């Protein structure tokens, strides 16, 4: 019980496909491109996360002022509550002061 | 990434194999055998 009786289907991986064979290309676009472009501009994803790093409270604060006017009402309400909970935890709870 | 223990079966068999010769439920139930295997050692 809790463990499968048969072996799973093999996990076949193509190590020489397009995405793996051309990974890392143009990462030094700045050094070798006379600094016309910056590597962070090659990052794709949420517009509030491109070329930026932070903790959950920092990520949530950044999302609310960058795309908060476009968020769904229910999702925005949960975001504000998440920021309230994290504000109390980080600034009032913990082992160190 | 959600990780789960996949080999919990072998973790308890290396304890119960030392309880096979005990009497009662402490030879097949980990919760009970683990406390009696440790007293035996």
């Amino acid at each position: 019980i809790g463990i499968r009786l048969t072996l799973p289907p093999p996990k076949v991986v193509d190590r020489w496909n397009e995405k793996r064979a051309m990974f890392g290309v143009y990462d030094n676009i700045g050094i070798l491109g006379n600094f016309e472009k910056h590597p962070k501009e090659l990052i794709r994803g949420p517009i509030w996360l491109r070329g930026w790093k932070g903790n959950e409270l920092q990520r949530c604060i950044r999302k609310r002022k960058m795309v908060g006017s476009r968020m769904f009402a229910d999702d925005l309400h949960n975001l504000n509550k998440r920021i309230r909970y994290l504000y109390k935890h980080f600034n009032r709870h913990g082992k160190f002061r | 990434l959600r990780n789960r223990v996949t080999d919990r079966y072998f973790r308890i068999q290396e304890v119960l194999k030392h309880a096979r010769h005990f009497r009662g439920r402490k030879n097949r139930c980990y919760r009970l055998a683990v406390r009696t295997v440790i007293r035996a050692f």
């Binding site: 463990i3 499968r4 009786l5 048969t6 072996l7 799973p8 996990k11 | 789960r4 996949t6 080999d7 079966y9 072998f10």
Partner: peptide, 26 residues
């Protein structure tokens, strides 16, 4: 179903051993 291959492979080996004991070969 849990993802992984190491535990399933290791469990197949114990099943073979159990089968040999129940049915030892000539």
């Amino acid at each position: 179903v849990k993802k992984g291959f190491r535990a399933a492979f290791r469990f197949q080996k114990e099943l073979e051993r159990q089968r040999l004991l129940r049915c030892p070969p000539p």
